[PDB]
Design a protein around this ligand. Structure first.
Ligand code: HEM
Ligand SMILES: CCOc1ccc(NC(C)=O)cc1
Length: 465
């Protein structure tokens, strides 16, 4: 045919807005999928987007045609601050340069290595201490968990951890959580469509912008302090590395290594390295209270493989298939980034006898892969067995795509995996969880779904084992 994928008919400017619910974007698009197939075109206001549903559609595009689908599309709320600068929301040579440098700098600062392992273990101990200080009292885990995750990437980017009592530290975390939650609301989803008007209008979007601006002002501040203390022979952190790279590139008029990219790349890492893991942890713990028998089984393995005295280390995962299945199932159930992060085609693309013009936006529906009925027996349930064979051994899935796949996939994946393993395991080793509520009545359905999947507010207690 050589045509754009089929889809419902758009109206000028508003696009397919009347055919969609902004409170439930994922459900809206999946419903439209039922009629037009797993590869269809939608109009998010003025934005023309090809939607890829289910495993085969997403993998075929994003891996089998990796280079063709490896452009970055928009996220309107985040583009408000980044403006195409920094590593995440950027394109071509910019994205290429920053991605290469960031991957390399994270390694030099210990990621994938012993150095960051020791850093995560130290921070996990500070979490345990904090959770003991609650004295088994009913509490909101939110910022306890976010504090601990954040201090890991903070270590890499700013040179050291924040004090848990730093009021500015909690301030930044509130900005992150707030901006994130916004993008998952119906207004955040409306904004994805009508940002041309809405960025200039009053509303909840303006407050979202203010939190993002806060985060920007704080990085800009940390950079200035690093510049006026810089030893160009001994970098303390990501910032100093980037500042040093900037010096070496000072006579290259076409460099990507300028101040704005430094500020934005550093914001990307601080944000990405905090909020997704945090959210996964919070959702994980509530999932576990809803399924206390899963927790029982987690406990059996921890006590057997690790025992009571030593701290979990990363290699313990090799001997711990049940824990590996549990964390996999949390990432699968939680589905933190349900519609991925928008890609776009780099040049004129043929895909499944559709034609996709250059610059075409693409929604890889990661949530529809994580729930694909061809890969999971009961996609709607929480069930570690999804990731286990008959002998109780860990079973990988091609449908396991929470970090996405292809050329612009998550490069924090390894860090994220190390953190989820060590934080989950050290908490579970030290505490049993208690809900303020009866396991029968715990609501594990999402509070919001949009750009992210946000779980419902809850309190709990950590009782010593
Ligand atoms: C459970 C935790 C995490 C999840 C579920 C997650 C998910 C994702 C997803 C879905 C993308 C979009 C990739 C694509 O376009 O296909 C992404 C990109 C990205 N993530 Fe993660 N992430 C997690 C943790 C992290 C961490 C810890 C970092 C810290 C460095 C990080 C940094 C990034 C960056 C810099 C990108 C953009 C890469 C690019 O555009 O080339 N993420 N992540
Ligand atoms: C889709 C990848 O996950 C992310 C990555 C970055 C961000 N936010 C910022 C400000 O970088 C939010 C979510």
């Amino acid at each position: 045919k050589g045509k754009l994928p089929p889809g419902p008919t758009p109206l000028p400017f508003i696009g397919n807005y009347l055919q969609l619910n902004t409170e439930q974007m994922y459900n809206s698009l999946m419903k439209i999928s039922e009629r037009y197939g797993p590869v269809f075109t939608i109009h998010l206001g003025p934005r023309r987007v090809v939607v890829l549903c289910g495993h085969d559609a997403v993998r075929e595009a994003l891996v089998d045609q990796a280079e063709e689908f490896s452009g970055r599309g928009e996220q309107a709320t985040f583009d408000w601050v980044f403006k195409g600068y920094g590593v995440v929301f950027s394109n071509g040579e910019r994205a290429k340069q920053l991605r290469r440098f960031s991957i390399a700098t994270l390694r030099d600062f210990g990621v994938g290595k012993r150095g960051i392992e020791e850093r995560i273990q130290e921070e996990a101990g500070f979490l345990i201490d904090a959770l003991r200080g609650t004295g088994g009292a009913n509490i909101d885990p939110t910022f306890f968990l976010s504090r601990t995750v954040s201090n890991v990437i903070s270590s890499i980017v700013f040179g050291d951890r924040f004090d848990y009592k730093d009021k500015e530290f909690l301030s930044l975390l509130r900005m992150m959580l707030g901006s994130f939650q916004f993008t998952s609301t119906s207004t955040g989803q409306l904004y994805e469509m009508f940002s041309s008007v809405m960025k200039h209008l009053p509303g909840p979007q303006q407050q979202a912008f203010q939190l993002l601006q806060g985060l920007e002002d704080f990085i800009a501040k940390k950079v200035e302090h690093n510049q006026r203390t810089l030893d160009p022979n001994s970098p303390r952190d990501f910032i100093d590395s980037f500042l040093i790279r900037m010096q070496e590139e000072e006579k290259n008029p076409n460099t990507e290594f300028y101040l704005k990219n430094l500020v934005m790349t550093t914001l990307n890492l601080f944000f990405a390295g905090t909020e997704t893991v945090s959210t996964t942890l919070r959702y994980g713990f509530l999932l576990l209270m809803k399924h206390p028998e899963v927790e029982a089984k987690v406990h059996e393995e921890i006590d057997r493989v690790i025992g009571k005295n030593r701290q979990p280390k990363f290699e313990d995962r090799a001997k711990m298939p049940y824990m590996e299945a549990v964390i996999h199932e949390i990432q699968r159930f939680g589905d933190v980034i349900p519609m991925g992060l928008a890609r776009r085609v780099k040049k004129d693309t043929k895909f499944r006898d559709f034609f996709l013009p250059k610059g075409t936006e693409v929604y890889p529906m990661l949530g529809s892969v994580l729930r694909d009925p061809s890969f999971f027996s009961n996609p709607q349930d929480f069930n570690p067995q999804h990731f286990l064979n008959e002998k109780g051994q860990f079973k990988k899935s091609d449908a396991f795509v929470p970090f996405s796949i292809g050329k612009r996939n998550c490069f924090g994946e390894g860090l994220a995996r190390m953190e989820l393993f060590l934080f989950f395991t050290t908490v579970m080793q030290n505490f049993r969880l208690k809900s303020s509520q009866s396991p029968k009545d715990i609501d594990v359905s999402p509070k919001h779904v949009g750009f992210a999947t946000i779980p419902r507010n809850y309190t709990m207690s950590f009782l010593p084992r």
